[PDB]
Amino acid sequence: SMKWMFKEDHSLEHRCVESAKIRAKYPDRVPVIVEKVSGSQIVDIDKRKYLVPSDITVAQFMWIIRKRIQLPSEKAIFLFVDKTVPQSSLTMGQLYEKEKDEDGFLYVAYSGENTFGF
């Protein structure tokens, strides 16, 4: 189970306000929080917060993260949104609706292994 440092760093209200602010200013983009699955071997990521157009796919977003942590192409990465790996043909906008947190953000976990959940 993920202990999100973004959630320990900011209160529920804080997160609710800021996500609503960013969604009002940029309604065609979805706010994303990215943290590494605890105990996974993969390198930690330098950038945690992401504002991405709802027109891009999950496969495209994964490339962004892969490139961010400079993961070799021959190494796997798996995204988790609430213990389940999301469909790569899905758009971040479609994905936002189904998996958005109570606070208005989309939380994405990543790992080098899919032993984490479903």
Side-chain angles (χ1 to χ4, degrees), residues 2-66 68-118:
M2 288 274 302
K3 198 193 297 177
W4 301 92
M5 301 310 157
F6 187 69
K7 292 198 169 180
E8 293 185 344
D9 282 344
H10 307 280
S11 73
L12 175 60
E13 279 73 359
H14 182 272
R15 300 181 324 235
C16 291
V17 168
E18 296 308 303
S19 81
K21 274 181 74 184
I22 196 71
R23 283 288 295 174
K25 291 177 175 182
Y26 310 94
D28 63 341
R29 300 182 72 107
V30 299
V32 180
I33 305 299
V34 174
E35 295 186 40
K36 154 183 150 28
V37 166
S38 182
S40 184
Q41 285 190 265
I42 205 170
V43 65
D44 215 330
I45 194 167
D46 70 340
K47 180 163 184 242
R48 169 178 300 165
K49 302 175 67 182
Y50 295 80
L51 190 61
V52 288
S54 308
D55 81 335
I56 68 169
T57 62
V58 176
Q60 282 175 310
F61 191 63
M62 209 186 317
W63 181 91
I64 294 179
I65 300 311
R66 289 179 68 93
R68 195 79 207 187
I69 60 174
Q70 290 180 346
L71 187 72
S73 74
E74 78 257 16
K75 282 200 195 297
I77 195 179
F78 300 93
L79 301 189
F80 294 91
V81 204
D82 199 24
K83 310 306 228 297
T84 295
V85 173
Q87 193 182 25
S88 75
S89 48
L90 211 60
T91 64
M92 293 308 277
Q94 292 169 6
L95 185 60
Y96 180 74
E97 301 289 328
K98 184 180 301 177
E99 303 284 352
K100 59 180 164 192
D101 194 87
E102 66 182 344
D103 67 9
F105 290 101
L106 175 67
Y107 290 78
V108 176
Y110 72 95
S111 183
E113 296 105 344
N114 61 345
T115 73
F116 178 67
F118 285 138

PDB file of all heavy atoms in Angstrom, residues 1-2 36-42 76-80 83-85 109-118, unseen atoms left out:
ATOM      1  N   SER A   1       0.828  -1.200   0.000  1.00  0.00           N
ATOM      2  CA  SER A   1       0.000   0.000   0.000  1.00  0.00           C
ATOM      3  C   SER A   1       0.865   1.253   0.000  1.00  0.00           C
ATOM      4  O   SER A   1       1.863   1.328   0.717  1.00  0.00           O
ATOM      5  N   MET A   2       0.471   2.234  -0.808  1.00  0.00           N
ATOM      6  CA  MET A   2       1.274   3.434  -1.023  1.00  0.00           C
ATOM      7  C   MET A   2       1.056   4.478   0.071  1.00  0.00           C
ATOM      8  O   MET A   2      -0.066   4.917   0.310  1.00  0.00           O
ATOM      9  CB  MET A   2       0.955   4.058  -2.386  1.00  0.00           C
ATOM     10  CG  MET A   2       1.483   3.296  -3.599  1.00  0.00           C
ATOM     11  SD  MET A   2       3.183   3.712  -4.026  1.00  0.00           S
ATOM     12  CE  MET A   2       3.048   5.478  -4.281  1.00  0.00           C
ATOM     13  N   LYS A  36       7.260   6.620  -6.585  1.00  0.00           N
ATOM     14  CA  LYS A  36       7.739   5.248  -6.755  1.00  0.00           C
ATOM     15  C   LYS A  36       7.170   4.260  -5.731  1.00  0.00           C
ATOM     16  O   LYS A  36       7.104   4.565  -4.538  1.00  0.00           O
ATOM     17  CB  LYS A  36       9.272   5.243  -6.705  1.00  0.00           C
ATOM     18  CG  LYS A  36       9.909   3.948  -6.259  1.00  0.00           C
ATOM     19  CD  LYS A  36      11.422   4.086  -6.189  1.00  0.00           C
ATOM     20  CE  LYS A  36      12.020   3.181  -5.116  1.00  0.00           C
ATOM     21  NZ  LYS A  36      11.209   1.961  -4.844  1.00  0.00           N
ATOM     22  N   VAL A  37       6.733   3.092  -6.213  1.00  0.00           N
ATOM     23  CA  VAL A  37       6.246   2.009  -5.354  1.00  0.00           C
ATOM     24  C   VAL A  37       7.326   1.600  -4.350  1.00  0.00           C
ATOM     25  O   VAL A  37       8.420   1.195  -4.740  1.00  0.00           O
ATOM     26  CB  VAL A  37       5.820   0.769  -6.186  1.00  0.00           C
ATOM     27  CG1 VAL A  37       5.650  -0.460  -5.299  1.00  0.00           C
ATOM     28  CG2 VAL A  37       4.534   1.043  -6.943  1.00  0.00           C
ATOM     29  N   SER A  38       7.014   1.710  -3.063  1.00  0.00           N
ATOM     30  CA  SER A  38       7.961   1.405  -1.983  1.00  0.00           C
ATOM     31  C   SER A  38       8.534  -0.011  -2.011  1.00  0.00           C
ATOM     32  O   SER A  38       7.793  -0.987  -1.917  1.00  0.00           O
ATOM     33  CB  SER A  38       7.296   1.641  -0.626  1.00  0.00           C
ATOM     34  OG  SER A  38       8.205   1.396   0.431  1.00  0.00           O
ATOM     35  N   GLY A  39       9.855  -0.120  -2.119  1.00  0.00           N
ATOM     36  CA  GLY A  39      10.509  -1.416  -2.159  1.00  0.00           C
ATOM     37  C   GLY A  39      10.831  -1.896  -3.562  1.00  0.00           C
ATOM     38  O   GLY A  39      11.577  -2.863  -3.744  1.00  0.00           O
ATOM     39  N   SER A  40      10.267  -1.217  -4.558  1.00  0.00           N
ATOM     40  CA  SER A  40      10.582  -1.516  -5.947  1.00  0.00           C
ATOM     41  C   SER A  40      12.032  -1.144  -6.161  1.00  0.00           C
ATOM     42  O   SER A  40      12.580  -0.322  -5.426  1.00  0.00           O
ATOM     43  CB  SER A  40       9.675  -0.746  -6.907  1.00  0.00           C
ATOM     44  OG  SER A  40       9.929  -1.103  -8.257  1.00  0.00           O
ATOM     45  N   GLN A  41      12.664  -1.735  -7.159  1.00  0.00           N
ATOM     46  CA  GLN A  41      14.089  -1.533  -7.296  1.00  0.00           C
ATOM     47  C   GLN A  41      14.352  -0.251  -8.046  1.00  0.00           C
ATOM     48  O   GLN A  41      15.312   0.448  -7.755  1.00  0.00           O
ATOM     49  CB  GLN A  41      14.749  -2.694  -8.039  1.00  0.00           C
ATOM     50  CG  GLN A  41      14.917  -3.974  -7.259  1.00  0.00           C
ATOM     51  CD  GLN A  41      15.788  -4.966  -7.997  1.00  0.00           C
ATOM     52  OE1 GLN A  41      15.293  -5.842  -8.708  1.00  0.00           O
ATOM     53  NE2 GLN A  41      17.096  -4.828  -7.839  1.00  0.00           N
ATOM     54  N   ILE A  42      13.441   0.083  -8.954  1.00  0.00           N
ATOM     55  CA  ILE A  42      13.600   1.203  -9.874  1.00  0.00           C
ATOM     56  C   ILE A  42      14.064   2.481  -9.173  1.00  0.00           C
ATOM     57  O   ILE A  42      13.790   2.689  -7.994  1.00  0.00           O
ATOM     58  CB  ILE A  42      12.261   1.445 -10.623  1.00  0.00           C
ATOM     59  CG1 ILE A  42      12.469   2.124 -11.976  1.00  0.00           C
ATOM     60  CG2 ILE A  42      11.249   2.161  -9.735  1.00  0.00           C
ATOM     61  CD1 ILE A  42      11.207   2.158 -12.813  1.00  0.00           C
ATOM     62  N   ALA A  76      11.666  -2.870 -17.922  1.00  0.00           N
ATOM     63  CA  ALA A  76      10.232  -2.662 -17.845  1.00  0.00           C
ATOM     64  C   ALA A  76       9.887  -1.590 -16.840  1.00  0.00           C
ATOM     65  O   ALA A  76      10.616  -1.358 -15.877  1.00  0.00           O
ATOM     66  CB  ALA A  76       9.526  -3.949 -17.478  1.00  0.00           C
ATOM     67  N   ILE A  77       8.758  -0.941 -17.077  1.00  0.00           N
ATOM     68  CA  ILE A  77       8.159  -0.082 -16.080  1.00  0.00           C
ATOM     69  C   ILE A  77       6.662  -0.356 -16.077  1.00  0.00           C
ATOM     70  O   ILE A  77       6.070  -0.671 -17.108  1.00  0.00           O
ATOM     71  CB  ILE A  77       8.470   1.418 -16.338  1.00  0.00           C
ATOM     72  CG1 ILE A  77       8.150   2.266 -15.095  1.00  0.00           C
ATOM     73  CG2 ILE A  77       7.710   1.930 -17.540  1.00  0.00           C
ATOM     74  CD1 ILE A  77       8.453   3.755 -15.259  1.00  0.00           C
ATOM     75  N   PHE A  78       6.063  -0.259 -14.899  1.00  0.00           N
ATOM     76  CA  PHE A  78       4.640  -0.492 -14.747  1.00  0.00           C
ATOM     77  C   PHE A  78       4.026   0.648 -13.976  1.00  0.00           C
ATOM     78  O   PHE A  78       4.529   1.035 -12.927  1.00  0.00           O
ATOM     79  CB  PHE A  78       4.371  -1.816 -14.032  1.00  0.00           C
ATOM     80  CG  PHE A  78       4.923  -3.008 -14.746  1.00  0.00           C
ATOM     81  CD1 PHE A  78       6.179  -3.494 -14.435  1.00  0.00           C
ATOM     82  CD2 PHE A  78       4.180  -3.647 -15.723  1.00  0.00           C
ATOM     83  CE1 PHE A  78       6.687  -4.592 -15.083  1.00  0.00           C
ATOM     84  CE2 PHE A  78       4.684  -4.751 -16.382  1.00  0.00           C
ATOM     85  CZ  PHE A  78       5.941  -5.224 -16.064  1.00  0.00           C
ATOM     86  N   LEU A  79       2.929   1.174 -14.496  1.00  0.00           N
ATOM     87  CA  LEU A  79       2.197   2.218 -13.800  1.00  0.00           C
ATOM     88  C   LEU A  79       1.066   1.607 -12.996  1.00  0.00           C
ATOM     89  O   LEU A  79       0.436   0.649 -13.432  1.00  0.00           O
ATOM     90  CB  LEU A  79       1.658   3.258 -14.785  1.00  0.00           C
ATOM     91  CG  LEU A  79       2.702   3.967 -15.646  1.00  0.00           C
ATOM     92  CD1 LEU A  79       2.064   5.101 -16.408  1.00  0.00           C
ATOM     93  CD2 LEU A  79       3.847   4.490 -14.796  1.00  0.00           C
ATOM     94  N   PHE A  80       0.854   2.122 -11.793  1.00  0.00           N
ATOM     95  CA  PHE A  80      -0.256   1.672 -10.977  1.00  0.00           C
ATOM     96  C   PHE A  80      -1.144   2.835 -10.589  1.00  0.00           C
ATOM     97  O   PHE A  80      -0.679   3.801  -9.996  1.00  0.00           O
ATOM     98  CB  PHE A  80       0.249   0.977  -9.716  1.00  0.00           C
ATOM     99  CG  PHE A  80       0.977  -0.296  -9.978  1.00  0.00           C
ATOM    100  CD1 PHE A  80       2.352  -0.299 -10.151  1.00  0.00           C
ATOM    101  CD2 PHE A  80       0.288  -1.493 -10.053  1.00  0.00           C
ATOM    102  CE1 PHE A  80       3.031  -1.474 -10.395  1.00  0.00           C
ATOM    103  CE2 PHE A  80       0.956  -2.675 -10.294  1.00  0.00           C
ATOM    104  CZ  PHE A  80       2.333  -2.666 -10.466  1.00  0.00           C
ATOM    105  N   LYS A  83      -3.600   0.280  -7.179  1.00  0.00           N
ATOM    106  CA  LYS A  83      -3.253  -1.146  -7.193  1.00  0.00           C
ATOM    107  C   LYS A  83      -3.463  -1.875  -8.527  1.00  0.00           C
ATOM    108  O   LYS A  83      -3.148  -3.053  -8.648  1.00  0.00           O
ATOM    109  CB  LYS A  83      -4.054  -1.878  -6.107  1.00  0.00           C
ATOM    110  CG  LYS A  83      -3.996  -1.237  -4.721  1.00  0.00           C
ATOM    111  CD  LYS A  83      -2.574  -1.023  -4.260  1.00  0.00           C
ATOM    112  CE  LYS A  83      -2.360  -1.524  -2.846  1.00  0.00           C
ATOM    113  NZ  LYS A  83      -3.188  -0.792  -1.861  1.00  0.00           N
ATOM    114  N   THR A  84      -3.980  -1.177  -9.528  1.00  0.00           N
ATOM    115  CA  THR A  84      -4.225  -1.784 -10.831  1.00  0.00           C
ATOM    116  C   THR A  84      -3.443  -1.058 -11.921  1.00  0.00           C
ATOM    117  O   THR A  84      -3.383   0.169 -11.933  1.00  0.00           O
ATOM    118  CB  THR A  84      -5.726  -1.797 -11.174  1.00  0.00           C
ATOM    119  OG1 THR A  84      -6.412  -2.645 -10.246  1.00  0.00           O
ATOM    120  CG2 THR A  84      -5.956  -2.327 -12.579  1.00  0.00           C
ATOM    121  N   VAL A  85      -2.833  -1.821 -12.822  1.00  0.00           N
ATOM    122  CA  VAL A  85      -2.126  -1.249 -13.960  1.00  0.00           C
ATOM    123  C   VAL A  85      -3.115  -0.785 -15.017  1.00  0.00           C
ATOM    124  O   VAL A  85      -3.976  -1.549 -15.433  1.00  0.00           O
ATOM    125  CB  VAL A  85      -1.157  -2.262 -14.591  1.00  0.00           C
ATOM    126  CG1 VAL A  85      -0.556  -1.706 -15.869  1.00  0.00           C
ATOM    127  CG2 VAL A  85      -0.070  -2.658 -13.603  1.00  0.00           C
ATOM    128  N   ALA A 109       1.449   5.439  -9.363  1.00  0.00           N
ATOM    129  CA  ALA A 109       2.625   4.777  -8.824  1.00  0.00           C
ATOM    130  C   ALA A 109       3.354   4.076  -9.958  1.00  0.00           C
ATOM    131  O   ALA A 109       2.733   3.635 -10.923  1.00  0.00           O
ATOM    132  CB  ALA A 109       2.237   3.789  -7.748  1.00  0.00           C
ATOM    133  N   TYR A 110       4.674   3.994  -9.861  1.00  0.00           N
ATOM    134  CA  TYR A 110       5.445   3.295 -10.878  1.00  0.00           C
ATOM    135  C   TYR A 110       6.395   2.299 -10.235  1.00  0.00           C
ATOM    136  O   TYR A 110       6.838   2.485  -9.108  1.00  0.00           O
ATOM    137  CB  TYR A 110       6.197   4.288 -11.775  1.00  0.00           C
ATOM    138  CG  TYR A 110       7.368   4.982 -11.130  1.00  0.00           C
ATOM    139  CD1 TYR A 110       8.659   4.494 -11.284  1.00  0.00           C
ATOM    140  CD2 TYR A 110       7.187   6.139 -10.382  1.00  0.00           C
ATOM    141  CE1 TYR A 110       9.729   5.125 -10.704  1.00  0.00           C
ATOM    142  CE2 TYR A 110       8.256   6.781  -9.802  1.00  0.00           C
ATOM    143  CZ  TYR A 110       9.522   6.266  -9.961  1.00  0.00           C
ATOM    144  OH  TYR A 110      10.589   6.896  -9.378  1.00  0.00           O
ATOM    145  N   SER A 111       6.684   1.224 -10.957  1.00  0.00           N
ATOM    146  CA  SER A 111       7.593   0.198 -10.473  1.00  0.00           C
ATOM    147  C   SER A 111       8.294  -0.521 -11.610  1.00  0.00           C
ATOM    148  O   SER A 111       7.878  -0.428 -12.759  1.00  0.00           O
ATOM    149  CB  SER A 111       6.841  -0.816  -9.617  1.00  0.00           C
ATOM    150  OG  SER A 111       7.733  -1.773  -9.083  1.00  0.00           O
ATOM    151  N   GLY A 112       9.368  -1.227 -11.277  1.00  0.00           N
ATOM    152  CA  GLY A 112      10.039  -2.087 -12.226  1.00  0.00           C
ATOM    153  C   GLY A 112       9.410  -3.467 -12.236  1.00  0.00           C
ATOM    154  O   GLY A 112       9.736  -4.298 -13.079  1.00  0.00           O
ATOM    155  N   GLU A 113       8.488  -3.699 -11.306  1.00  0.00           N
ATOM    156  CA  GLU A 113       7.827  -4.999 -11.166  1.00  0.00           C
ATOM    157  C   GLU A 113       6.320  -4.833 -10.984  1.00  0.00           C
ATOM    158  O   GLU A 113       5.874  -3.877 -10.351  1.00  0.00           O
ATOM    159  CB  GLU A 113       8.393  -5.768  -9.966  1.00  0.00           C
ATOM    160  CG  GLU A 113       9.862  -6.154 -10.070  1.00  0.00           C
ATOM    161  CD  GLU A 113      10.761  -5.293  -9.201  1.00  0.00           C
ATOM    162  OE1 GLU A 113      10.313  -4.218  -8.747  1.00  0.00           O
ATOM    163  OE2 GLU A 113      11.921  -5.694  -8.967  1.00  0.00           O
ATOM    164  N   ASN A 114       5.544  -5.768 -11.528  1.00  0.00           N
ATOM    165  CA  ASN A 114       4.092  -5.741 -11.385  1.00  0.00           C
ATOM    166  C   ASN A 114       3.595  -6.729 -10.342  1.00  0.00           C
ATOM    167  O   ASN A 114       2.489  -7.251 -10.443  1.00  0.00           O
ATOM    168  CB  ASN A 114       3.395  -6.001 -12.728  1.00  0.00           C
ATOM    169  CG  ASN A 114       3.724  -7.363 -13.326  1.00  0.00           C
ATOM    170  OD1 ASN A 114       4.666  -8.039 -12.915  1.00  0.00           O
ATOM    171  ND2 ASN A 114       2.950  -7.755 -14.329  1.00  0.00           N
ATOM    172  N   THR A 115       4.428  -6.989  -9.343  1.00  0.00           N
ATOM    173  CA  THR A 115       4.037  -7.815  -8.213  1.00  0.00           C
ATOM    174  C   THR A 115       3.161  -7.021  -7.236  1.00  0.00           C
ATOM    175  O   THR A 115       2.595  -7.584  -6.302  1.00  0.00           O
ATOM    176  CB  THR A 115       5.265  -8.357  -7.459  1.00  0.00           C
ATOM    177  OG1 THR A 115       5.882  -7.301  -6.714  1.00  0.00           O
ATOM    178  CG2 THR A 115       6.272  -8.947  -8.430  1.00  0.00           C
ATOM    179  N   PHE A 116       3.059  -5.712  -7.463  1.00  0.00           N
ATOM    180  CA  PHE A 116       2.422  -4.783  -6.530  1.00  0.00           C
ATOM    181  C   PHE A 116       0.931  -5.037  -6.361  1.00  0.00           C
ATOM    182  O   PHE A 116       0.455  -5.236  -5.240  1.00  0.00           O
ATOM    183  CB  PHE A 116       2.648  -3.341  -7.007  1.00  0.00           C
ATOM    184  CG  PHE A 116       1.991  -2.292  -6.145  1.00  0.00           C
ATOM    185  CD1 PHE A 116       2.415  -2.069  -4.842  1.00  0.00           C
ATOM    186  CD2 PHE A 116       0.951  -1.524  -6.645  1.00  0.00           C
ATOM    187  CE1 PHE A 116       1.810  -1.099  -4.056  1.00  0.00           C
ATOM    188  CE2 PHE A 116       0.344  -0.556  -5.868  1.00  0.00           C
ATOM    189  CZ  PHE A 116       0.774  -0.342  -4.571  1.00  0.00           C
ATOM    190  N   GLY A 117       0.191  -5.038  -7.463  1.00  0.00           N
ATOM    191  CA  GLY A 117      -1.234  -5.298  -7.384  1.00  0.00           C
ATOM    192  C   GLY A 117      -1.801  -6.209  -8.453  1.00  0.00           C
ATOM    193  O   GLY A 117      -1.226  -7.247  -8.777  1.00  0.00           O
ATOM    194  N   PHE A 118      -2.953  -5.814  -8.983  1.00  0.00           N
ATOM    195  CA  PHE A 118      -3.618  -6.547 -10.048  1.00  0.00           C
ATOM    196  C   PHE A 118      -2.870  -6.391 -11.369  1.00  0.00           C
ATOM    197  O   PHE A 118      -2.227  -5.369 -11.620  1.00  0.00           O
ATOM    198  CB  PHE A 118      -5.060  -6.064 -10.190  1.00  0.00           C
ATOM    199  CG  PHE A 118      -5.982  -6.563  -9.103  1.00  0.00           C
ATOM    200  CD1 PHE A 118      -6.922  -5.717  -8.536  1.00  0.00           C
ATOM    201  CD2 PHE A 118      -5.903  -7.871  -8.644  1.00  0.00           C
ATOM    202  CE1 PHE A 118      -7.768  -6.163  -7.546  1.00  0.00           C
ATOM    203  CE2 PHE A 118      -6.749  -8.320  -7.646  1.00  0.00           C
ATOM    204  CZ  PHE A 118      -7.678  -7.464  -7.101  1.00  0.00           C
TER     205      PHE A 118
END
